């Protein structure tokens, strides 16, 4: 039985990463050789729920990338927003994704840190848009500037190109101690928010010029 | 007993994603062929631990997206606010939904981030303003003014079908160093809120100026 | 011996959710069908442990409501408040608990989410008022002016039905730099604070106002 | 032996909430009646490791509770704070303990909740109080008004009987761009340190307006 | 082999908390009467496990609060800052530790709680005051008024007691818009700092005032 | 067999850290020697899981150091920024790497509180410069001025150098109560950015100067 | 064969802190003497298990300590920064380190709590002083004062042999509504750094008043 078990453990072992491929094969040698390593794999368990709650982050991570890019959530080039960041997406690797700030800066998350993320580049964009105006100054006055600051923006033809449908004049949407608040809404095409955004503000501070509108002011009362 | 248990192993193996089931057969047969395979199972089951810590958040996502469905809680279209998210939902997969923000993102919130979430669509909509008035001026008068405010509100038709009941007049409900709170209630349509709080504070700044009730004025004394 | 096998594996299946239950069913054949499946048991343990981790928010949140149900916490229609949400409580579910806020919305809590929660409908309710006299005042004269307030106060019949016992002044509670601040206290009815904090802040306005009690201003000083 | 282990069974059976406790008397018959349910004990187990992590704050909380208890922490009608919440304990469970805040709430806290907290009623209770004088006042003017202030108050027969031992003139404690502050102390029986506190207040007002003691005053410099 | 199995369980369990201790004895009872209980064992160990992550706290709290005494870091008497709470401690259990906050209350604080903590009674107290100075004034003329007011403060006999060494003056330490701060170090016996501190500020005041130096002023521009 | 078991645990112990090896094989020893150690491998299995939650953050971190190392996302001399701080990395060991800050610290960060870390030395580097202006101000000359400005950098021989491509104006981005906001970007050599930044706004302040365009200033109205 | 045992357990019993070792003996032996303890071994492992989660935190800081050890990171008598916290390493235990705070405490943080730490003998130290002069004044004016204060700091022969090198005299870097913004940098010895900041700050509150250099001034505008 001697011989014979000496020759099945070496035909096993010919049927035998490598370190630990290696431990086990003298561990599964040890076992079918005359010894019960039980506590020998205790110590071999704990090193490798150890190892375990160790390289879990790999698969996670992966599994989550796989995940988001099966909802079609992010590609190159994209604009996202991660958390406290906002950037463009610059590559993707199977573990973690490359977002540019607009700082120069080059974050690398790693997908588990992705919870909940933003993305620009899905559909339509919108513009929401709140301007303040004294207290005491004509509502109706105001009102007609901003709807005529927003007509010359609708003029300038390489803007209105942007502009999907027509402009959504609220009204006042709020008081303050001091000032009520404009807002005019509109609907743009991805990724063109902010150049609308910035074209309507210009428009806005001319025209607010032109009719006399003031911007608030405080007030004080003295003894 | 060595060609019977060969015969075994084979009608076995021909009994028996892919890969993994390859090396669990592995597993069973070197296991019925001749080898106790404890360190090799320790080995195979610390690297089933790793994937399940890691394809847990899969299943208990669609678990919550599936009882989420069961209580009515979010339907494609409606207006609901996560955490310090606030938008419209565009679309539910089977492990995350899609909320699109008023500012044009395209938010993607995984089931899981979602433990309390609120909606705009079911039932009513309610609206508390709340107004400042100088603590000098005369509460009655105020008090009138918010009251002709409102009544001319109740007025336009086209608002007065957005409102259920009758508004809840509170009267002061506050006071700071320079000014005293009015209050006013609402119980409207839902999802209507915001266009009866505009008209209403459009309404509140026409009618404090023409009572002449002032706003506050913060006050100093020198020496 | 293995007719007598397929026999007794006949009888063990005709005596054994529905895929799960088969592929159980089957693990335990392929166990007594000539079979030792200590892998495959491996990587159904590691699915049962992913679901297991998964299906554990339902219990904990069912067995949290119930415990929560047999403290007599939480009714329909009571006034609710949990972490940063104050609402009505609107219906009550197997897992979750609807609150209806102020502002319209219909938040679903699932309990879980629920440590620690306040409840405004369990026998009395207090008021504690808080008013500010410019520090300069005289200290009887404001205190008597707000005695004189209360007073009227629990004269309006409206009112009184809704205070318990006699109100309690403190006297001056602390003081600013350009401030001290009295304060009076209540005992009332359930639910009715608020209309009875309300009714002293009108009257306190007024009577401060008779009384030619000053608000407190903040004092400056040139080079 | 058929009829021997059918009759071994029943007698077993015979010798064996409901609910589970039945389905782990079926599983022990079916494991002694010629099956070997090793995967069916892995759904079971998985089952009861959910109801585990479940259960578990129940039994949690109860020997947190018991803890708490020893120690003489609490009891019924003291007042407590617990994390951001202060107010009375009104009745404590096997599971929970309700707090009556002074805004009318009554919050149910569950043991395992709380952590570290604070309670009012155990031996003594002191005075901190500070108070703010213009820097440009003379320093030992102010402090002898206070202490003044102070001699009036332990005149007062009413208070003398709370206040244990004598107070804690510190002189100045602090100076900032425009005032500096100084500082008494006590120690006074529980429970009552409020009323001494308020009773010291207006001492303080009436005598630094007898001394014509300044309070601190913002400075400016023009150009 | 009846009677005789009933002889070795008698004997067993005449061999053999008390509740507990009896299901342990009516299991290995019935294990060893002709019964394999394994899904009994699987109840009871998810029951031992409920209770083994409850009954953590415990062992846990005892033993942080065993090493923290090893190390002699808190004694009964003694000054401590525990997380956001600074106080004395009254006395030390085998769970928890008593500090006396300043306001009177009587914190209670487990052990697991305290990760890290400071203490007031070893060795050396230290003391660094910061005074602020108008941006215009002569550097030279407020330091050399400070070096005066540190000269009489070290003149005091009961304070000079206090201090160890010298003090040391470090001259500007800092800009503001407004101001440029002095800063003057000590070194003094332990748990006297604060007394160190308010003598200075006293003396601080009092010798400013005579050499004439002012308080940082704010400074404003008009049109 | 006495003999021969003697013999054959003699042979295994000669087949057969150091302390823990130790203790492994006199577990086995006392094993096969008419020992069967269930519960001593239960005491020992504790103290491995202890040591295995205890050890598991050296191999954490050494798999999260090369996945990091993997992307080529950190190397000596590269400017960093991992969570609330930025600085430059000196050196990478194993286990952690070693950042200065600019203050001169010595950061010491292991990879484990690594999740998300931004990199400035990554291709280019970008410049967002905003700029007020008064409110009352002619937009088209605070922007002529601006861009005269920027030309004048341009001209400067050691910047030009350093910019890549050619500015971007924006014109206004928005508008406050008081001013409006002038904005540039640019594209620059990486890690570059703050010398262009500081040059510019060196060349802004000038040019503000000389075209008079008036910085935002805060506006009152008294009465 | 009784007899036999009965020896068999008397040698092993012979053959075999104190107290749990008492009990495993306890359980080997009712193990080997006729009876199987699968529940008293399930009550067993409870317990061992509890203490397990309880005395982790001991090997758990050890390892970290001996880690941080390893690099050097930290020795007896540094400055280090652990958190919130800034102070003099005292002393260092197989547990926790004693970090002298400035303010006298004495803190003891345990090595699980220290993930990052900063440290500030490592080789150089650092200097960034920032300045701020009224938007009105000259560049060239202000710059050139700066230039002459650090020129005379240079020529300060205590102070010289601090700096490592040559300042390095940014320019502006950065403006605001009302100041503009000089930086200069420095490199020093360790641990040096403040006194180099002390001087410099001194030489240049004095170089701005000698050439006229105001600070920055609030501006209004009234009507």
């Known amino acids: 039985x001697x011989x014979x078990x000496x020759x099945x453990x070496x035909x096993x072992x010919x049927x035998x990463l490598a370190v630990i491929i290696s431990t086990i094969t ?9 010894v019960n390593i039980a506590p020998l794999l205790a110590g071999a368990g704990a090193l490798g729920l150890a190892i375990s709650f160790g390289s879990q982050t790999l698969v996670k991570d992966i599994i989550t990338g796989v995940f988001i890019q099966f909802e079609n959530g992010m590609n190159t080039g994209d ?31 790693p997908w588990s840190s992705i919870t909940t993320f933003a993305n620009f ?21 105001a009102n007609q500037a901003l709807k005529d600051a927003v007509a010359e923006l609708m003029e300038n033809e390489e803007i209105r190109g942007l502009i999907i449908g027509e ?45 006399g509108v003031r911007a608030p002011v405080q007030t004080y009362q003295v003894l």
């Open 26 to 34: 003298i561990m599964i040698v040890l076992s079918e050789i005359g």
């Open 79 to 109: 604009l996202v927003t991660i958390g406290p960041l906002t950037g463009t997406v610059e590559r993707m690797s199977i573990r973690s994704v490359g977002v540019r700030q607009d700082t120069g800066a080059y974050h690398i998350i």
């Open 121 to 141: 580049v899905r559909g339509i964009g919108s513009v929401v848009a709140n301007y303040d105006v004294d207290r005491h100054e004509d509502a109706d006055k």
């Open 167 to 211: 402009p959504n004049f609220a009204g006042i949407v709020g008081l303050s101690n001091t000032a009520f608040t404009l807002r005019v809404s509109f609907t743009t095409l991805p990724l063109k928010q902010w150049t609308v955004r910035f074209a309507l503000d210009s428009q806005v501070k001319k025209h607010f010029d032109l009719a």
